[PDB]
Amino acid sequence: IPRPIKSSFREGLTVLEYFINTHGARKGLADTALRTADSGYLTRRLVD
DNA sequence: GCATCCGTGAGTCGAGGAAGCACAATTTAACACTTTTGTCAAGC
């Protein structure tokens, strides 16, 4: 997104900046749940 | 011979909550009666 987050967590984020921040924050948290699942499947194939 | 489609797989522990009758055949209980067993008392 070209529009950055000009504010800092010290200065506080505007209402709008928070909405666009959750876009990437939640997508990365959903990636965490997926990567652990595929890595476990990969590990079982390596072991066997 | 080629591609569409079926088959298989996608983390680990936890924790918790919802029709009706008749009639023959048969097994089950129910009873009268005999044997088998646990018993009390008296005497050898």
UniProtKB/Swiss-Prot annotation:
Origin: domain of life: Bacteria
Family statement: Belongs to the RNA polymerase beta' chain family.
Role of this protein: DNA-dependent RNA polymerase catalyzes the transcription of DNA into RNA using the four ribonucleoside triphosphates as substrates.
Complexes and interactors: The RNAP catalytic core consists of 2 alpha, 1 beta, 1 beta' and 1 omega subunit. When a sigma factor is associated with the core the holoenzyme is formed, which can initiate transcription.
Protein's UniProt name: DNA-directed RNA polymerase subunit beta'
Organism: Mycolicibacterium smegmatis (strain ATCC 700084 / mc(2)155)
Residue range from the parent sequence: 831 to 878 of 1317
